[PDB]
Design a protein around this ligand. Structure first.
Ligand SMILES: Cc1c(-c2cc3cc(NC(=O)O[C@@H]4CCC[C@H]4C#N)ncc3c(N)c2F)cnc2c1NCCO2
Ligand code: NA
Length: 289
């Protein structure tokens, strides 16, 4: 798949770090030959990370023509550092957007949900889990397209697991079911459907439920037996279809939670008037008011 064995600095000038750490090491960069902007994500590579495995995963990323996946433009591999070259989004994430525009309309939220569900459907059909659906991780490109980033690669998933090791502590005395559970980390493909439901509330209310309470307390609230799925705050403002989308996306039991494909036949994401003009409107509002 032609992973270049060259310093990406050869071809690109780094301009600005993106995300303030939440995106790891991602940069807005300018191609030197053309004038074009890109996103360069830098995944640190361990010696253990096999370069052939990588090549398998990258080819998948390269051949993707899905409309709801951030586009792959290439990748470099220089001095134990992999770089992924993607499209750059002036408008950034839906979080960057609503922090200027304010809450999205129901129709805007409905569109974002349809497009993400399409992205999720694609990921899940490749036995991939996003694991981090949220406003911050949904990019709106210059054409008003809604896209998820696909980082289904071993070295990336590897770095997340490095964090989780510091979390779960030393493993040598751990039982195999404790090791298995800790690796998985409870993440299953339907976790993305729950995360989208929270996202829709985030898009509607400018923050996820319980965001005014400390993470530690919330972790305890969440894992109480009686914990209830959150709902939208202001009843009057939203249609029954939105409330329902939320009800069904935010099902507690994963055995009873609907998949991306089933959710694409929900009232909310099937309704007329869902077009990218909704997003273009949002973009004009961001950049003007
Ligand atoms: C979303 C993400 C990205 C990621 C972020 C991107 C951001 C932008 N654009 C951007 O941030 O724009 C500024 C924000 C507003 C002002 C703008 C100025 N300068 N454009 C393209 C991006 C892109 N292709 C990506 F893959 C990289 N790694 C990640 C995650 N999620 C979590 C896991 O790791
Ligand atoms: Na673009």
């Amino acid at each position: 798949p032609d992973i270049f064995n060259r310093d990406p600095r050869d071809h690109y000038d780094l301009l600005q770090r993106l995300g303030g750490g939440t995106y790891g090491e991602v940069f807005k960069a300018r191609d030197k030959v053309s004038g074009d902007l890109v996103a360069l994500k830098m995944v640190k590579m361990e010696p253990d990370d096999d370069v052939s495995t990588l090549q398998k995963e990258i080819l998948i990323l390269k051949t993707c023509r899905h409309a709801n996946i951030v586009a792959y433009h290439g990748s470099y591999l220089w001095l134990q550092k992999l770089w992924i070259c993607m499209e750059f989004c002036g408008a950034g994430s839906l979080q960057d957007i609503y922090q200027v525009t304010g809450s999205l309309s129901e129709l805007q939220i409905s569109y974002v949900c349809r497009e993400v569900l399409q992205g999720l459907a694609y990921l899940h059909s490749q036995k991939k889990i996003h694991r981090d659906i949220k406003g911050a991780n949904i990019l709106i490109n210059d054409a008003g397209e809604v896209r998820l980033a696909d980082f289904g690669i071993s070295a990336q998933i590897g770095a997340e697991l490095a964090r989780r090791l510091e979390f779960i502590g030393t493993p040598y005395w751990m039982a195999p079911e404790v090791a298995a559970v800790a690796l998985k980390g409870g993440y299953n493909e339907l976790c993305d459907i729950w995360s989208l439901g929270i996202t829709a509330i985030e898009l509607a209310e400018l923050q996820p439920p319980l965001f005014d309470v400390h993470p530690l307390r919330v972790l305890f609230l969440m894992t109480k037996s009686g914990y209830q799925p959150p709902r939208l705050k202001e009843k009057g403002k939203w249609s029954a279809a939105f409330h329902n989308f939320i009800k069904v996306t935010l099902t507690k039991s994963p055995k009873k939670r609907p998949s991306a494909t089933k959710m694409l036949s929900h009232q909310l994401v099937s309704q007329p008037g869902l077009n990218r003009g909704l997003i273009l409107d949002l973009l004009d509002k961001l950049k003007n008011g």
